[PDB]
mmCIF file of C-alpha atoms and ligand atoms in Angstrom:
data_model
loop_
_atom_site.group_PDB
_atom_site.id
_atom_site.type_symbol
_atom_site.label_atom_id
_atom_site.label_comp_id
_atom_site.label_asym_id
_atom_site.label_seq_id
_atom_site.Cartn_x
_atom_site.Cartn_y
_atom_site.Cartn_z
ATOM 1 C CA UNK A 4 81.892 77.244 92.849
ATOM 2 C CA UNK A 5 79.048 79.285 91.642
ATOM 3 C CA UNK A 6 81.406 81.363 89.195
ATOM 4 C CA UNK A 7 83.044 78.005 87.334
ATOM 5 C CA UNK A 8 82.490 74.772 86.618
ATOM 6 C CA UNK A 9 83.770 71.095 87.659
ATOM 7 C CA UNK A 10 86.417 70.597 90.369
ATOM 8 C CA UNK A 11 89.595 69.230 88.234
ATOM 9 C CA UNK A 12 91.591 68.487 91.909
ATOM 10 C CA UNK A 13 90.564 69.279 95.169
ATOM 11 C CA UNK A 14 92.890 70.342 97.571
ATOM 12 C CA UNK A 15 93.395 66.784 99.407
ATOM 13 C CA UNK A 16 94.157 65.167 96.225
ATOM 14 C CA UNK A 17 96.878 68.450 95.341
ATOM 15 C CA UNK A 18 98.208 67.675 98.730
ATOM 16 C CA UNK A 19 98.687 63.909 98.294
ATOM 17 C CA UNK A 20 100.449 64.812 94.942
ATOM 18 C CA UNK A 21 102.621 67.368 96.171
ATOM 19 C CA UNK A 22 103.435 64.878 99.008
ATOM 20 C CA UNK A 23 104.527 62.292 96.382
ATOM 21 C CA UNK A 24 106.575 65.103 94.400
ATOM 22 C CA UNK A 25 108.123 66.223 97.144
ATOM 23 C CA UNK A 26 109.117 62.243 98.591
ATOM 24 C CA UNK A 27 110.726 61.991 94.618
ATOM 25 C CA UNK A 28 112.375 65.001 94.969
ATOM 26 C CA UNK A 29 113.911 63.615 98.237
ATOM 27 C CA UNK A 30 115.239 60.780 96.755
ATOM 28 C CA UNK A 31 116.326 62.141 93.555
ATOM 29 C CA UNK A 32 118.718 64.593 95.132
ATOM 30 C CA UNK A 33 119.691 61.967 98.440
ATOM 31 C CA UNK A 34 123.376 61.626 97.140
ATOM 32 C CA UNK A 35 123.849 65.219 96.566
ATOM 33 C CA UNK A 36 124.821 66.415 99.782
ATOM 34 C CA UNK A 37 122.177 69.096 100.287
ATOM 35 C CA UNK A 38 122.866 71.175 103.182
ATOM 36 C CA UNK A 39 121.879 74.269 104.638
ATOM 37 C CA UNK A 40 123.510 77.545 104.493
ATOM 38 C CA UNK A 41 126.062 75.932 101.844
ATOM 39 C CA UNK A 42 124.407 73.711 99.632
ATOM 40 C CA UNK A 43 120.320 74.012 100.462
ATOM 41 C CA UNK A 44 117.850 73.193 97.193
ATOM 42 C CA UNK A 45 117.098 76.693 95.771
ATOM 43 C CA UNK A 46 113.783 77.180 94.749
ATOM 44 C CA UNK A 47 113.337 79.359 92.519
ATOM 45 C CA UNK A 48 109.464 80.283 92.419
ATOM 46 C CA UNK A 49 107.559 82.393 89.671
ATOM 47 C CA UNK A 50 105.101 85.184 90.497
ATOM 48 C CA UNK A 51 102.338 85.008 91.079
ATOM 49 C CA UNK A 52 100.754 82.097 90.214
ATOM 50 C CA UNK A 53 103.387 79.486 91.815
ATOM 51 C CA UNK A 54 103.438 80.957 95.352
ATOM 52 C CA UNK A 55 100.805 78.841 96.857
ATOM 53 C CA UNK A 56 102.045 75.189 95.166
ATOM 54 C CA UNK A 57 105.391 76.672 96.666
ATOM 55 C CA UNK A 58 104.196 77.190 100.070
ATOM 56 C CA UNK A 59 103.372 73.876 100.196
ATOM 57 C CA UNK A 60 106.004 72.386 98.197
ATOM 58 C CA UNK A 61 108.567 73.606 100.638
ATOM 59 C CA UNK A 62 106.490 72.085 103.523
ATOM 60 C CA UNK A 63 106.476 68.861 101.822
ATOM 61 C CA UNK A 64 110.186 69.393 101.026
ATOM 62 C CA UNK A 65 110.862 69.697 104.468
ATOM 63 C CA UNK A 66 109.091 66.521 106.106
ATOM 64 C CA UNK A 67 111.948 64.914 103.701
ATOM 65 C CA UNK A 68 114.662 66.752 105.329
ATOM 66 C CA UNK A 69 115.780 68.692 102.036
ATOM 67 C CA UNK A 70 117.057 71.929 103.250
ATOM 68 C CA UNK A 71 115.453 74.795 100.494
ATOM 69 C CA UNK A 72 116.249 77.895 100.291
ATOM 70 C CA UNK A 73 113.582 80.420 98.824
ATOM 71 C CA UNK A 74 114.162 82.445 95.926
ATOM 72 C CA UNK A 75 111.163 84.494 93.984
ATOM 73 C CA UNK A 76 111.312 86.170 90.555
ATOM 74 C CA UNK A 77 109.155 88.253 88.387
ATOM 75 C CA UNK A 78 108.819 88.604 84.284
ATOM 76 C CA UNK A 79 106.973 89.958 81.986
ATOM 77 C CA UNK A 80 106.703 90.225 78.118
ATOM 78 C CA UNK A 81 106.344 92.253 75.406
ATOM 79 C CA UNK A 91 110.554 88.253 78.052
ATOM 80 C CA UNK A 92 112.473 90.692 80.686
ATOM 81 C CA UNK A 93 113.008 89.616 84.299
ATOM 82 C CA UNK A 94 111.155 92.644 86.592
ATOM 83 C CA UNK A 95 112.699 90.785 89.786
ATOM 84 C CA UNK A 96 115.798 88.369 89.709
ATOM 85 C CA UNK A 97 117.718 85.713 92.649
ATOM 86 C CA UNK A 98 118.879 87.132 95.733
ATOM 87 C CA UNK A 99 122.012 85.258 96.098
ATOM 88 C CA UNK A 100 123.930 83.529 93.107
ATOM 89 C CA UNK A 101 122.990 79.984 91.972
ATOM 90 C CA UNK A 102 126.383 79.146 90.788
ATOM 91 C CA UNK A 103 127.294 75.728 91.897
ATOM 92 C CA UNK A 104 124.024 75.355 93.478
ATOM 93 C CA UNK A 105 121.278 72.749 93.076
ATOM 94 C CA UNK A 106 118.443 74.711 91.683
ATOM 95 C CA UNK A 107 114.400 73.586 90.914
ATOM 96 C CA UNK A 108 112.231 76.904 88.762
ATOM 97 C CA UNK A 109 108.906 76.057 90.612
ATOM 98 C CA UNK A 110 105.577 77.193 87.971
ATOM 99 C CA UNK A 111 102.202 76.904 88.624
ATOM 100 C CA UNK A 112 101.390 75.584 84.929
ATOM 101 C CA UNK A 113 103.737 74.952 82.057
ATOM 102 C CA UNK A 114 101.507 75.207 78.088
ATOM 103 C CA UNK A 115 103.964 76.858 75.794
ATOM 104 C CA UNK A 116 107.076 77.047 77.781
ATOM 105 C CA UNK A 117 107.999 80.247 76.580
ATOM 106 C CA UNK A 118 108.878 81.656 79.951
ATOM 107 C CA UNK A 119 109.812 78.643 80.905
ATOM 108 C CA UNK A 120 112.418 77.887 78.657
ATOM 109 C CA UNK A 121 113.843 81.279 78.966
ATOM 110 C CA UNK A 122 114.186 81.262 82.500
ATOM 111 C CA UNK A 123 115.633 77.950 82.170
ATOM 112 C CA UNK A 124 118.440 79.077 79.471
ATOM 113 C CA UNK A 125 118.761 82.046 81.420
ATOM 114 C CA UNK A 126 120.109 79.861 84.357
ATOM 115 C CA UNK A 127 121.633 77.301 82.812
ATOM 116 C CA UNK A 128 124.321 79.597 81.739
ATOM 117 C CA UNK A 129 124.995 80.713 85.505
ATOM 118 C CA UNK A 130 126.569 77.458 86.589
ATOM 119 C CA UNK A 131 124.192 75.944 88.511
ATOM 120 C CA UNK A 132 125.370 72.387 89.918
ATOM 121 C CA UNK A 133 122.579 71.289 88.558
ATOM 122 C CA UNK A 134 119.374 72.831 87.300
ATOM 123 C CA UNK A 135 115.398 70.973 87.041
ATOM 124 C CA UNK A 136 112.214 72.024 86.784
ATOM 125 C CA UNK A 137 108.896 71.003 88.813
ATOM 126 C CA UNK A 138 105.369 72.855 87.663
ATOM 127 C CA UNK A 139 102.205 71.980 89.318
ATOM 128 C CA UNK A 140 100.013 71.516 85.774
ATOM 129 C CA UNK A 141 101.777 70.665 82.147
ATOM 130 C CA UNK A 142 99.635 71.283 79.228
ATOM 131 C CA UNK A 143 101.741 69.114 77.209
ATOM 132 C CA UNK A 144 100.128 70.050 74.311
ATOM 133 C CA UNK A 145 100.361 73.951 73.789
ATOM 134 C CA UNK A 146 103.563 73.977 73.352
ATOM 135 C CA UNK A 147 104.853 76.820 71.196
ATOM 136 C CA UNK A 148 108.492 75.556 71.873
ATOM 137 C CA UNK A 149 110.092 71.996 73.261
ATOM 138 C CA UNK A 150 110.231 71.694 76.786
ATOM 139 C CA UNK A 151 110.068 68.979 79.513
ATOM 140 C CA UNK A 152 109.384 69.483 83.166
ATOM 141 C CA UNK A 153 111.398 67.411 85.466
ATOM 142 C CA UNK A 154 108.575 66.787 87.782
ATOM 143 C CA UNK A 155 105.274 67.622 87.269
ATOM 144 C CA UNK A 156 102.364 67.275 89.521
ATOM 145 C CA UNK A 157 99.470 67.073 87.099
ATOM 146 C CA UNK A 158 99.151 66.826 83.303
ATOM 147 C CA UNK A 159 96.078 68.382 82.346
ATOM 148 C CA UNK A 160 93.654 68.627 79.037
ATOM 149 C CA UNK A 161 93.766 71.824 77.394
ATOM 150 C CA UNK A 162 90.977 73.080 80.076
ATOM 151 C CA UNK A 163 91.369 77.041 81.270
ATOM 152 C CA UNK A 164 91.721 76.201 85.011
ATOM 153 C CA UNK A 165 91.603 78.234 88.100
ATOM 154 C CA UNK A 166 92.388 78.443 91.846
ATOM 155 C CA UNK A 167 95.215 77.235 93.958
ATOM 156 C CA UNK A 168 97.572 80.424 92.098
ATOM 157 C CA UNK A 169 95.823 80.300 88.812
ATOM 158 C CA UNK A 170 93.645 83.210 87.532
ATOM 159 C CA UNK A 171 91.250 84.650 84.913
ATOM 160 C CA UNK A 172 93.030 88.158 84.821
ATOM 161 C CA UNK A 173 94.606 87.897 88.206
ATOM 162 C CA UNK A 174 91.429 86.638 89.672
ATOM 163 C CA UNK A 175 90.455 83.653 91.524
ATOM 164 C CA UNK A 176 94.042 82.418 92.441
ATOM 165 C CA UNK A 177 92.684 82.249 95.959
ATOM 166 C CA UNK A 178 90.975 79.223 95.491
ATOM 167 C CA UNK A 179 91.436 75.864 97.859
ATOM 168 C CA UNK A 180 90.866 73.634 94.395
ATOM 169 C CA UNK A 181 91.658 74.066 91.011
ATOM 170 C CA UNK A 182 88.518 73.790 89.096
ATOM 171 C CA UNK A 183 87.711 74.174 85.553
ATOM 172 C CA UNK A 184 86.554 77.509 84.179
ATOM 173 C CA UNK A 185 86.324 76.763 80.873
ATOM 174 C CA UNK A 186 85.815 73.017 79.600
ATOM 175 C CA UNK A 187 88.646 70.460 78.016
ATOM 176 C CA UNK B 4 113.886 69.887 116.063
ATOM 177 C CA UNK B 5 117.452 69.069 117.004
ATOM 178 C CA UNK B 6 118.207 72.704 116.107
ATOM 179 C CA UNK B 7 114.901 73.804 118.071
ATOM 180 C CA UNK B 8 115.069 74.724 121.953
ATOM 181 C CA UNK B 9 110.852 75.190 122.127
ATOM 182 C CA UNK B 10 108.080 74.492 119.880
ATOM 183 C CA UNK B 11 105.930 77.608 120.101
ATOM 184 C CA UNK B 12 102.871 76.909 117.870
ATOM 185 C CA UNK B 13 102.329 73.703 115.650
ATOM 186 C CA UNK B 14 101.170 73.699 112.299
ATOM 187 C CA UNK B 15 97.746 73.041 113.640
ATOM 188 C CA UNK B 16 97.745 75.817 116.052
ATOM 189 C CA UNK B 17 98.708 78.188 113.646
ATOM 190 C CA UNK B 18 96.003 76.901 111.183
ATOM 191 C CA UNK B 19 93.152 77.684 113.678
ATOM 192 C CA UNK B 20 94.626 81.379 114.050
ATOM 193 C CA UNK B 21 94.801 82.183 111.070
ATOM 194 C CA UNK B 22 91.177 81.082 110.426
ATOM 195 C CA UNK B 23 90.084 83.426 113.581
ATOM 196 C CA UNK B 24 91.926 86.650 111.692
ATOM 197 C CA UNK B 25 90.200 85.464 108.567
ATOM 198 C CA UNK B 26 86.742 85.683 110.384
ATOM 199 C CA UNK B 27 87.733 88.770 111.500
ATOM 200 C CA UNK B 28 88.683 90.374 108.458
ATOM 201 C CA UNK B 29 85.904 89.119 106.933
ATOM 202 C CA UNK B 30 83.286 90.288 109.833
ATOM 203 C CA UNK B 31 85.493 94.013 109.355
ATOM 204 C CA UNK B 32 84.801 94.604 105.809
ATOM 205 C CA UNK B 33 81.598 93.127 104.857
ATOM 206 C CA UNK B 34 79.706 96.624 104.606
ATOM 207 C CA UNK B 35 82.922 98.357 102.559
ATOM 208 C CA UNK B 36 82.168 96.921 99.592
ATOM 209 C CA UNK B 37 84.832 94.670 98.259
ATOM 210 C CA UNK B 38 83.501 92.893 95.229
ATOM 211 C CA UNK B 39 85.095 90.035 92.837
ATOM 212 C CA UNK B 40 87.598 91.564 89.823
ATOM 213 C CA UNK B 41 86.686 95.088 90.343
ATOM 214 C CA UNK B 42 86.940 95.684 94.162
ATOM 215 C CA UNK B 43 89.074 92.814 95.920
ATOM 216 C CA UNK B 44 90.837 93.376 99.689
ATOM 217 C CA UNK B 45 94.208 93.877 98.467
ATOM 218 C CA UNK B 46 96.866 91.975 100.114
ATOM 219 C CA UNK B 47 99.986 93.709 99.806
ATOM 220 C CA UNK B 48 102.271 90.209 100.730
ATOM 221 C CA UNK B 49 106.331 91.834 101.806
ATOM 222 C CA UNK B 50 108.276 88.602 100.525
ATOM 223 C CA UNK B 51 110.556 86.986 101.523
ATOM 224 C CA UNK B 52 108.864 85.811 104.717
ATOM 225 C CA UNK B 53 105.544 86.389 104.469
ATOM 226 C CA UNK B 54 104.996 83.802 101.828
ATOM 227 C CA UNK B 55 103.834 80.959 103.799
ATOM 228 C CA UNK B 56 101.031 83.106 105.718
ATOM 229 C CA UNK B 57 99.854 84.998 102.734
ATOM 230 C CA UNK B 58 99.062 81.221 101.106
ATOM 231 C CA UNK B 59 97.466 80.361 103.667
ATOM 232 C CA UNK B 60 95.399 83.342 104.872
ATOM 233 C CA UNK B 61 94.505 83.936 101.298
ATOM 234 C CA UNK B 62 92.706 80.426 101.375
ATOM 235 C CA UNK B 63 90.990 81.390 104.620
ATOM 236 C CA UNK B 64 89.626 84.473 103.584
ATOM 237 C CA UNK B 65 88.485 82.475 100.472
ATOM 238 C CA UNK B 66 86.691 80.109 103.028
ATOM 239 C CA UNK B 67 85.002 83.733 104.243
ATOM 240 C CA UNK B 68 84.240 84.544 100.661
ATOM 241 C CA UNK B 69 86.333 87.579 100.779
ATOM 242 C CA UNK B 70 87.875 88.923 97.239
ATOM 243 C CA UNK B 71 91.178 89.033 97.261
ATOM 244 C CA UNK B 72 94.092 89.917 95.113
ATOM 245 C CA UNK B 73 98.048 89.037 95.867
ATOM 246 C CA UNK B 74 100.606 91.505 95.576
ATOM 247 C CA UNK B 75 104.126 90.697 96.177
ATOM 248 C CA UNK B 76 106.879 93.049 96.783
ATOM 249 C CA UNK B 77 110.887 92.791 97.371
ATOM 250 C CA UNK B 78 112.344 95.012 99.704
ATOM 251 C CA UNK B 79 116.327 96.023 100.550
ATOM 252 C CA UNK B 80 118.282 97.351 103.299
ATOM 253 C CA UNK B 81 120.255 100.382 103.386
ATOM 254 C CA UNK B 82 124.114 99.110 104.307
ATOM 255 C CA UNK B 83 124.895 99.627 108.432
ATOM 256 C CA UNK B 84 123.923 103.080 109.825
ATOM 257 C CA UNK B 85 122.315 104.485 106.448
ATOM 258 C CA UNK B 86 118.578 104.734 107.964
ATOM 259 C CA UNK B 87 117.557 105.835 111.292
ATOM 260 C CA UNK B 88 114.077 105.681 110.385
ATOM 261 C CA UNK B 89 113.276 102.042 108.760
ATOM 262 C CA UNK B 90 113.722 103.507 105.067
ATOM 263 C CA UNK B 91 114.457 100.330 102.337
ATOM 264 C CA UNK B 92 114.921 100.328 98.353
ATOM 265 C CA UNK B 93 112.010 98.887 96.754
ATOM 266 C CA UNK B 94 112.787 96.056 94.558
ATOM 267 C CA UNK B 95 109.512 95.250 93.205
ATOM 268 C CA UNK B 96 106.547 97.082 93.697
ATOM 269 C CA UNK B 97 102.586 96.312 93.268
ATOM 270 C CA UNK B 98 102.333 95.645 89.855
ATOM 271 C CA UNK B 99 98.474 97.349 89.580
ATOM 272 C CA UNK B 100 97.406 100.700 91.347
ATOM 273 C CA UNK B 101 95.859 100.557 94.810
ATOM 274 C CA UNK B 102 93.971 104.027 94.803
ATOM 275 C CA UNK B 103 90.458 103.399 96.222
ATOM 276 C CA UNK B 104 90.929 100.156 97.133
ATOM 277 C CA UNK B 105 91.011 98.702 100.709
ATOM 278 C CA UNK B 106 94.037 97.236 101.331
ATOM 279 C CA UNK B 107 96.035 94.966 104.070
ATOM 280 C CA UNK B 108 99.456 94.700 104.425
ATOM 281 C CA UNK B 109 100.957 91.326 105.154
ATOM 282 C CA UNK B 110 104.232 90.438 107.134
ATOM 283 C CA UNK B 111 105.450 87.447 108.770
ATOM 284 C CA UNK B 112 106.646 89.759 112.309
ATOM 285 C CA UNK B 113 106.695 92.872 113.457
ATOM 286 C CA UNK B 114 109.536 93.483 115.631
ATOM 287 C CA UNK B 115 111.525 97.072 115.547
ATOM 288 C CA UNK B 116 108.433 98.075 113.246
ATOM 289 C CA UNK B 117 111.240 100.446 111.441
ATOM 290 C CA UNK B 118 110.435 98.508 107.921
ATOM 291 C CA UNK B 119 106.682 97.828 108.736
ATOM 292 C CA UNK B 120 106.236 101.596 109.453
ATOM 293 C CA UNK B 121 107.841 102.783 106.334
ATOM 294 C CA UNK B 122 105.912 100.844 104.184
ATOM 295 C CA UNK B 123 102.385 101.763 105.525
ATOM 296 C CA UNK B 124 103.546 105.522 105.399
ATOM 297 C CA UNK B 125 104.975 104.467 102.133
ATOM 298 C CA UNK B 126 101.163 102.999 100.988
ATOM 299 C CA UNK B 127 98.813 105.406 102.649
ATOM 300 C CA UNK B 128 100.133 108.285 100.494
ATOM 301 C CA UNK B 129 98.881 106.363 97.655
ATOM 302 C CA UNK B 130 94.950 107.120 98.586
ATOM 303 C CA UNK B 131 93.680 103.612 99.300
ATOM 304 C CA UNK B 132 90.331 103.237 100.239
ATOM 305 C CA UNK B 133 91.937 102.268 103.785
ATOM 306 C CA UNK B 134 94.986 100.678 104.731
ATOM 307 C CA UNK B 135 95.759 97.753 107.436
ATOM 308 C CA UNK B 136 98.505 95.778 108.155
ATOM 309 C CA UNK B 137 98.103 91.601 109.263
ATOM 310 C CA UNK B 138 101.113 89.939 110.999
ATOM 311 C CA UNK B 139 101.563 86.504 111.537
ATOM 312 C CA UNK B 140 103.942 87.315 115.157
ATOM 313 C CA UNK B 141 104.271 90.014 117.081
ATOM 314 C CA UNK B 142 107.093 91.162 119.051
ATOM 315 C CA UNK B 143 104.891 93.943 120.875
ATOM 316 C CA UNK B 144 107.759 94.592 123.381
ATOM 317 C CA UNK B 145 110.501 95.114 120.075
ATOM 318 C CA UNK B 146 109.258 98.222 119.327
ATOM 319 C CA UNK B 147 111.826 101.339 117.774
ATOM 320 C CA UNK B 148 109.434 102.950 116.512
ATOM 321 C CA UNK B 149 105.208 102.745 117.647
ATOM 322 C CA UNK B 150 103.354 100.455 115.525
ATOM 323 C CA UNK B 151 100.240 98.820 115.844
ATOM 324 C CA UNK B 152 98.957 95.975 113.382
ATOM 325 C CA UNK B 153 95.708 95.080 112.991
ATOM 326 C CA UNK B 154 95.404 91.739 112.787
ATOM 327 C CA UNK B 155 97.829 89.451 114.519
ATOM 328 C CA UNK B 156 97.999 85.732 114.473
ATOM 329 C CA UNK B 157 100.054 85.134 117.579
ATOM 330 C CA UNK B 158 102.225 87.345 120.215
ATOM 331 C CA UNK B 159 105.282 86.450 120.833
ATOM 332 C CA UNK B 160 108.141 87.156 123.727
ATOM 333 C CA UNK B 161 111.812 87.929 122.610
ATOM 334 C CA UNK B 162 112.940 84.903 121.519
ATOM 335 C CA UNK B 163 114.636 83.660 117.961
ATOM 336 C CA UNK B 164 111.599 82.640 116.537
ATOM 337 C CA UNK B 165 111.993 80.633 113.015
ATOM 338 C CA UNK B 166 109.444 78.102 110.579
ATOM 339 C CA UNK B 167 106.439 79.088 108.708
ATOM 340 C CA UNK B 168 108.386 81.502 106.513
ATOM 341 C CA UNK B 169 110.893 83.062 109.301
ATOM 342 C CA UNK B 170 114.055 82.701 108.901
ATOM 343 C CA UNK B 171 117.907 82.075 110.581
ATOM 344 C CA UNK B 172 120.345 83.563 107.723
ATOM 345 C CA UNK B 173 117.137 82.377 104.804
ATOM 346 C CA UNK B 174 117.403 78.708 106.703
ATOM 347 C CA UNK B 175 114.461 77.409 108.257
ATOM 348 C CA UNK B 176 111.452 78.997 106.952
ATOM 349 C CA UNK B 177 110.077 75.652 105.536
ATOM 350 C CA UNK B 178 109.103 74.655 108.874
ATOM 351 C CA UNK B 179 105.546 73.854 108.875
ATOM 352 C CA UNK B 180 105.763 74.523 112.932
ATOM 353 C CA UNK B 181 107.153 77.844 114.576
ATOM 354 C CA UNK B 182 109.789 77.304 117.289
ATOM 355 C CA UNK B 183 112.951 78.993 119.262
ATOM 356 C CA UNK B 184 116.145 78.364 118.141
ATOM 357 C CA UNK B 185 118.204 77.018 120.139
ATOM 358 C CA UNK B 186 121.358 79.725 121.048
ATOM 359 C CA UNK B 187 123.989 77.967 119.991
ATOM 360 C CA UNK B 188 122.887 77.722 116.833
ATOM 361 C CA UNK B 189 123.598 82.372 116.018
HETATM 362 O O1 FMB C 201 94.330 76.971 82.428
HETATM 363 C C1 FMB C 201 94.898 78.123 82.673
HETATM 364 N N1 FMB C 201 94.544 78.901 83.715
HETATM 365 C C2 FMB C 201 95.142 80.093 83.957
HETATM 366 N N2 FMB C 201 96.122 80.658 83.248
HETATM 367 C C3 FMB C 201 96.506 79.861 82.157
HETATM 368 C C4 FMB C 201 97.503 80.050 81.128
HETATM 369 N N3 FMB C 201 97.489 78.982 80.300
HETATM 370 N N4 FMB C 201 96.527 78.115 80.749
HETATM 371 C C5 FMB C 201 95.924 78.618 81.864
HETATM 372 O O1 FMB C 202 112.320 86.192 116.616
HETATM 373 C C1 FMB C 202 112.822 86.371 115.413
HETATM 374 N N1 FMB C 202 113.092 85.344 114.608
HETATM 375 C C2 FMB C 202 113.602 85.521 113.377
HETATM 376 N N2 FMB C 202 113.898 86.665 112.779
HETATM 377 C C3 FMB C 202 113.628 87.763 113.592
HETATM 378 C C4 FMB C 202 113.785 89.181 113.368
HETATM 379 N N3 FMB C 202 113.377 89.837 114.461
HETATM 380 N N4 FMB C 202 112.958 88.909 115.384
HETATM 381 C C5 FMB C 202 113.093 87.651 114.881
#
């Protein structure tokens, strides 16, 4: 990549995470009686940047056997939702999938936003956690990689909606 | 499969396809200028269904060096009967302008065409710099109104097709394969 610097994670090693999320996942919600049409994980993805890590996540969800059913919002902030669910989550078994968690101010709204709509249960899995910019507490329930604070690119992040294309996340501006 | 009657394309199959449209689409617009930030191919991605393909196309057209920037947009139906002519509520349009730009529609089938039609009469009027439309499956023999895509990963027959994004009542479209479903299932 001409236009950036170092690969942080090439697309094998996303895969092979995402495979390993995905086989947690699995087990995590075994006993919960997952089923489709009644009782299917909902996975609640955030545009843009979590559509391709969702893609996959759902692909890796399925050679589990978790039944998922799709869901995909839209915010934006001054935070106001521009797109909400489908179908109600109440009583459901819901995951908020995010490309990259660093303050958690969406985040957390979304998930207090949800959390008051009876959910069965309600987690959170991101693909990168900046741990560190936080602007407000917040844990991830599964998280695929915790990176430095790095501005990163590709596989549904972007430099002003650009790049999210990419096949491997790589490092635009250094950690 | 249990739940499957015929696998039509695996994962792999599919893979290779969508590579082939990607060389197309790349071999199409390398003299119209499409250029990183200021001038990407726009894909216009209908969710729900298209999801899957628009991942991975976007990453094959990447493999093509081809610009490219992701729309998503949430359509509705009209109750039963409303629309005799494919017209749907927009839930959530593009979020940035596509005047002058060259841009592709993406959809996971075209069947009836009613929605598919709609929304490229719906786009053209906007003054793109041209406007296509990329299907993963085609129903060619569907058709309730004419429609022609561009681009199209596979053709189909009339069967219930779900997987890679397709759906039976928003069940199955995790599938990394495509298959029938069996007709005791709807
Ligand atoms: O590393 C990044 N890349 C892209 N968008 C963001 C927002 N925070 N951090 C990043
Ligand atoms: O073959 C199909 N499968 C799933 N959904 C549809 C809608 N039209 N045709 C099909």
């Amino acid at each position: 990549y001409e236009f950036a610097e170092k690969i942080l994670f090439t697309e094998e090693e996303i895969r092979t995470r995402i495979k390993e999320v995905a086989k947690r996942i699995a087990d995590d919600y075994k006993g919960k009686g997952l089923r489709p049409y009644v009782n299917p994980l909902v996975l609640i993805s955030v545009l843009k940047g979590s559509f391709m890590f969702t893609a996959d996540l759902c692909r890796a969800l399925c050679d589990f056997n978790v039944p998922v059913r799709m869901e995909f919002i839209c915010v934006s902030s001054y935070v106001r939702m521009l797109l909400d669910t489908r179908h109600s989550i109440e009583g459901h078994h819901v995951l908020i999938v995010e490309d990259i968690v660093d303050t958690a101010l969406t985040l957390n709204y979304l998930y207090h936003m949800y959390f008051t709509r009876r959910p069965a249960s309600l987690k959170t899995v991101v693909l990168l956690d900046k741990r560190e910019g936080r602007r407000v507490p917040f844990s991830a329930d599964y998280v695929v990689a915790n990176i430095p604070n790095a501005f990163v690119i590709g596989y549904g992040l972007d430099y002003d909606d650009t790049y999210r294309e990419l096949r491997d996340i790589v490092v635009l501006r250094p950690e």
